Design an enzyme around this catalytic site. Structure first.
Site, PDB file in Angstrom:
ATOM      1  N   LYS D  10      30.394  45.378  21.064  1.00 22.41           N
ATOM      2  CA  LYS D  10      30.005  46.214  19.890  1.00 22.41           C
ATOM      3  C   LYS D  10      31.209  47.075  19.562  1.00 22.41           C
ATOM      4  CE  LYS D  10      26.089  46.698  17.614  1.00 22.41           C
ATOM      5  NZ  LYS D  10      25.382  45.388  17.457  1.00 22.41           N
ATOM      6  N   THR D  57      24.806  42.611  21.930  1.00 25.08           N
ATOM      7  CA  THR D  57      25.699  43.689  21.504  1.00 25.08           C
ATOM      8  C   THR D  57      24.864  44.923  21.158  1.00 25.08           C
ATOM      9  OG1 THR D  57      25.789  43.075  19.156  1.00 25.08           O
ATOM     10  CG2 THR D  57      27.382  41.963  20.682  1.00 25.08           C
ATOM     11  N   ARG D 176      69.813  64.227   6.914  1.00 23.06           N
ATOM     12  CA  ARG D 176      68.678  63.657   6.159  1.00 23.06           C
ATOM     13  C   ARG D 176      67.342  64.230   6.588  1.00 23.06           C
ATOM     14  NH1 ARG D 176      67.846  57.643   9.048  1.00 23.06           N
ATOM     15  NH2 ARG D 176      67.178  58.618  11.042  1.00 23.06           N
ATOM     16  N   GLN D 228      65.541  55.988  17.239  1.00 19.80           N
ATOM     17  CA  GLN D 228      65.681  55.359  18.568  1.00 19.80           C
ATOM     18  C   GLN D 228      66.024  56.401  19.634  1.00 19.80           C
ATOM     19  OE1 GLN D 228      66.590  54.060  15.652  1.00 19.80           O
ATOM     20  NE2 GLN D 228      66.833  51.828  15.742  1.00 19.80           N
ATOM     21  N   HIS D 256      60.554  57.098   4.645  1.00 17.14           N
ATOM     22  CA  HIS D 256      61.776  57.476   3.933  1.00 17.14           C
ATOM     23  C   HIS D 256      61.548  58.420   2.780  1.00 17.14           C
ATOM     24  CE1 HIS D 256      63.629  54.399   6.364  1.00 17.14           C
ATOM     25  NE2 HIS D 256      62.808  53.484   5.875  1.00 17.14           N
TER      26      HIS D 256
HETATM   27  O1  LIG Z   1      66.794  56.264  12.610  1.00 16.64           O
HETATM   28  C1  LIG Z   1      67.047  55.182  12.026  1.00 16.64           C
HETATM   29  N1  LIG Z   1      67.056  54.053  12.764  1.00 16.64           N
HETATM   30  C2  LIG Z   1      67.350  52.852  12.246  1.00 16.64           C
HETATM   31  O2  LIG Z   1      67.338  51.832  12.954  1.00 16.64           O
HETATM   32  C3  LIG Z   1      67.647  52.783  10.788  1.00 16.64           C
HETATM   33  N2  LIG Z   1      67.966  51.787   9.893  1.00 16.64           N
HETATM   34  N3  LIG Z   1      68.071  52.499   8.677  1.00 16.64           N
HETATM   35  N4  LIG Z   1      67.877  53.896   8.759  1.00 16.64           N
HETATM   36  C4  LIG Z   1      67.605  54.036  10.086  1.00 16.64           C
HETATM   37  N5  LIG Z   1      67.285  55.191  10.693  1.00 16.64           N
HETATM   38  O1  LIG Z   2      25.099  36.269  17.132  1.00 15.06           O
HETATM   39  C1  LIG Z   2      24.906  37.262  17.875  1.00 15.06           C
HETATM   40  N1  LIG Z   2      25.608  37.337  19.025  1.00 15.06           N
HETATM   41  C2  LIG Z   2      25.450  38.335  19.904  1.00 15.06           C
HETATM   42  O2  LIG Z   2      26.121  38.376  20.949  1.00 15.06           O
HETATM   43  C3  LIG Z   2      24.475  39.409  19.564  1.00 15.06           C
HETATM   44  N2  LIG Z   2      24.044  40.573  20.157  1.00 15.06           N
HETATM   45  N3  LIG Z   2      23.123  41.070  19.208  1.00 15.06           N
HETATM   46  N4  LIG Z   2      22.918  40.267  18.065  1.00 15.06           N
HETATM   47  C4  LIG Z   2      23.784  39.245  18.315  1.00 15.06           C
HETATM   48  N5  LIG Z   2      24.021  38.212  17.489  1.00 15.06           N
END
Ligand SMILES: O=c1[nH]c(=O)c2nn[nH]c2[nH]1
Ligand SMILES: O=c1[nH]c(=O)c2nn[nH]c2[nH]1
Ligand SMILES: O=c1[nH]c(=O)c2nn[nH]c2[nH]1
Ligand SMILES: O=c1[nH]c(=O)c2nn[nH]c2[nH]1
Ligand code: NA
Ligand code: NA
Ligand code: NA
Ligand code: NA
Lengths: 295, 295, 295, 295
Positions: D10, D57, D176, D228, D256
């Site tokens: 779920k 589920t 920058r 980096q 940017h």
């Molecule tokens: O911090 C940056 N890392 C990058 O790899 C990069 N490429 N363009 N500007 C950038 N700035």
């Molecule tokens: O198709 C379903 N699969 C499941 O595992 C399930 N659990 N509740 N309803 C369900 N329906």
């Protein structure tokens, strides 16, 4: 401390390309969003402030547009492989390129029953994607996928015979709504390099189409015992139809539609065989995954 | 201080309804999101903590499901009018009901070239909406609309001859991409009440279809001088085709696709007649509006 | 047909401005998103393809950056008035400018208990907005607002004594959770023009602060009889504290948190006085509005 | 074909819990979104329609609320471990539980300089998350993280000395704007089981606080040579301050802000040392990642 892993590049690069057929006058557009991340001998940019090793992310963005200018952008499996191969061949210290591409739908409009030459409609947010990992000495790994395929069937879905214990309140059912957003990924056998990827080009669009067709048909025709059982039938068929696929993975939410008991109001009957009005639930949702491979 | 205006109710009520044809076995689904806000003699809930005047928003939610159970949910113009009329007739002190409905696409799937009985696909996030204002003594005002219709044409759009002054850098162009998300609203002449709305029921779906068809055709075929000029042609046609419409309003973003000059790289030619790869711009965007009515 | 209304311009123009104090070294940033739409004698661009009347939306975008370069961007009420006045004075045929501004939070970081000179954090998606309508011959109308202020109180909220009929299932309660996203707008008396707006500049930030403070205090301290009753108390106070405000409008969702009955599991007690775990509901939601003005 | 991998459960289970101190009257709320996916001997639900193996589920959703009712929900590392341990101990055929938790901010309001007993504000969309994998026979693996921490510094960021070739247009810069959304994850050494997780409980909140503090301080004080280099300094410090952490991973977009050349308009100076107004770019964006571990 030490750098155990590192990758960097440019994400969310939107790209559009138009092809113009001068004979027929027909134009075809392609629009994608591209991410390219690089790996290689780049640890010193992190540890020593040595920028000498960095192919600027701005330069990666330029390369994407240049590559799209000089090569086909379709099928995306090919485009991605060309783009990834470029970086590992061009740069000695870069040893892997990871390229993700999301393709956006621009479907030719039909106007008065005939295909229009240069107008298009976004018919749905469904995407076709690829992940291409190009690794020096290890070839090209490609995962292709469709996502955002949203479907619903109003009957022929069941869910009964599940485990019941002191945590269980869900009633068994022999007729429910089933609705999901399909995410399906097929993983290609490893390719030796670009020449091999080129040699299989016709299979990429065909397999995408097969995956979509199998998904829709099976969803519509299976009298479904569970999401689990239905998605397995889908993956089984795709693998049977394309031998170059190693695995198929599905991830399916169960988007619940709840009956609304209205009997408190003038004995109004709206449950079981009488259920007509339902409350779609935004959350929570079942989430069901499986990866199917060959015996 | 004094309450100058007040309205309250329930928003975001998701509703699904299925119709089952017992003869043919064919099922048709409808899914919508509904908002109902009320006005009337309710000032004292705000000023005196007098809750006696409040029809609980939870009760409004119940009423929406009950009304959907007992009435057709299509066309939404009718459903909305029935829902609004209910509140002003049922409650003496409530004098206006404002009902907004967003209809979501569930398009019958074609499997092997034939329409499937009970499976559907969300083909696009395009919506059909209505706003219905039901006001005691003043009838029923209905605005119908389509929204989220996303289109692009790759040529046959121009933009030249605009004002140039010391704030202008944009170059004139005789060939560009035009792309937009269409929001179109048509406003019906006021209806006296539910009986009159019922009497015009067939016009609602027909006019919606006409509005969509006119939008797509005009967009595709107009050699467009501007967004302004093209949207005016659309609105003009809708008004000509349905006499019960008083006004048509369009709101169109201009979703820009920019040329990318690549000549800095090996003299690569990608502008003007040579432009093949473009950069779609997420923002900013032109926004163009107009409301067209009768001479 | 005829153009009944028209407006056009540029939406989603992101703007950042930095101020650098050379004495202290302290830097302050402002970031906003701006929309400017124009009206005037522009019908012929729609009806005759006469672009001569169009100040290009690209030129409007240029003007926004230029105006931000040459003027203060704070308070946004002033910036908006300067920007709107520019267009109606500069262009003879443009008679109204509609300027919307959304201000984004960049709050100076405290590092080691002291305010950092040039680093900032986005502390919440809460916005401060203005709508400024500058209309030739009719002065400057300003609506200021805060939005996206999301709050919750876990007790001291009640809701009982509401209308009960055959549509009602909601139980009366004397202790619930109340949670909302506050949207509050105060409308200034009309200003004759820019000189008058300038003369009231100190009131804009002060009134914004008062509106926020009143909202938070009242929400926290009112033992609330309803959303209606609590929002009225808020609006009442703002109007009392600033005589240049004509009306205050509030729009408050009721974001429901539902009790979960767990007694089916080992008689576990989790309702009424014993309620500890709740299920927040994404939808539907109450929506409550009011506009308060002077006696 | 064969099932190679499967997990299901779920997702998107929203949970709120209130604690009420009867002595002081002070209330504290916790709100989270929880996902639990299970693995084990469940292949036959996919291949044979054998639902007997499926813990529904819906039952998983019930269990989450029950567990929150009977246990502390804080720190989330503990809650997640308790929830995962439950499923693998309760069910013989379920051998792994994967629990993801996103915690939402509800910060106690200060009203008139004093902490309010039961009112709270969402101060930012920043989250604290955990991923807990509870695998039978292999203990408990916990990854903790913060995400959505959006920051900007207006100076003291540089980027020069990067690779320049025929793909490069970016100019070197010594001053920058740097702005990012911080995603930081620290991975704990494997725990033998719940008793060990309990024994380290005080470290979870302390380490989260340290990670956040180190992130903010370093970002604000580093005269940054690159994203980096700055992120490496952050990860280095976290690892130094908590010996139970094995690795720290950072993923930082470079959001940017572009200079706008305005010299075309009356020689207006807005670049380099004169840059005051910038255009924030929504996309593309640099994306920089690194995982740092111990020598
Ligand atoms: O911090 C940056 N890392 C990058 O790899 C990069 N490429 N363009 N500007 C950038 N700035
Ligand atoms: O198709 C379903 N699969 C499941 O595992 C399930 N659990 N509740 N309803 C369900 N329906
Ligand atoms: O504060 C409230 N106002 C209302 O109008 C309402 N209706 N249901 N719960 C409610 N709570
Ligand atoms: O169609 C357009 N209308 C306009 O008003 C405009 N301004 N720039 N480009 C434009 N395109
Ligand atoms: Na290489
Ligand atoms: Na009435
Ligand atoms: Na004017
Ligand atoms: Na087990």
């Amino acid at each position: 401390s030490a750098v155990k892993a590192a990758r960097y590049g440019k994400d969310n690069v939107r790209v559009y390309k138009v092809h113009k057929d001068e004979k027929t006058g027909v134009q075809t557009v392609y629009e994608m969003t591209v991410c390219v991340l690089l790996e290689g001998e780049i640890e010193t940019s992190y540890t020593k402030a040595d920028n000498s090793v960095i192919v600027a992310t701005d330069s990666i963005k330029n390369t994407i547009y240049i590559t799209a200018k000089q090569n086909p952008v379709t099928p995306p499996e090919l485009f991605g492989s060309i783009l990834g191969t470029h970086f590992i061949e061009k740069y000695n210290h870069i040893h892997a390129a990871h390229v993700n591409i999301v393709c956006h739908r621009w479907t030719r409009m039909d106007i008065d029953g005939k295909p229009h030459p240069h107008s298009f409609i976004r018919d749905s947010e469904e995407k076709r994607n690829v992940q291409v990992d190009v690794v020096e000495g290890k070839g090209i790994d490609i995962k292709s996928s469709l996502s955002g395929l949203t479907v619903l069937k109003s009957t022929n879905s069941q869910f009964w015979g599940f485990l019941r214990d002191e945590y269980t309140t869900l009633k068994e059912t022999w007729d429910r709504i089933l609705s999901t957003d399909v995410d399906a990924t097929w993983q290609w056998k490893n390719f030796s390099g670009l020449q091999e990827v080129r040699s299989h080009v016709p299979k990429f669009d065909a397999t995408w189409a097969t995956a979509r067709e199998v998904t829709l048909k099976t969803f519509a025709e299976d009298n479904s015992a569970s999401v689990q059982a239905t998605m397995y039938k889908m993956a089984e068929q795709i693998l049977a139809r394309q031998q170059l696929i190693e695995t198929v993975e599905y991830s399916l939410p169960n988007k619940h539609y709840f009956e609304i008991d209205l009997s408190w109001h003038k004995g109004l009957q709206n449950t079981g065989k009488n259920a007509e009005v339902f409350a779609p639930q935004s959350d929570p949702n079942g989430l069901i995954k499986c990866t199917v491979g060959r015996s």
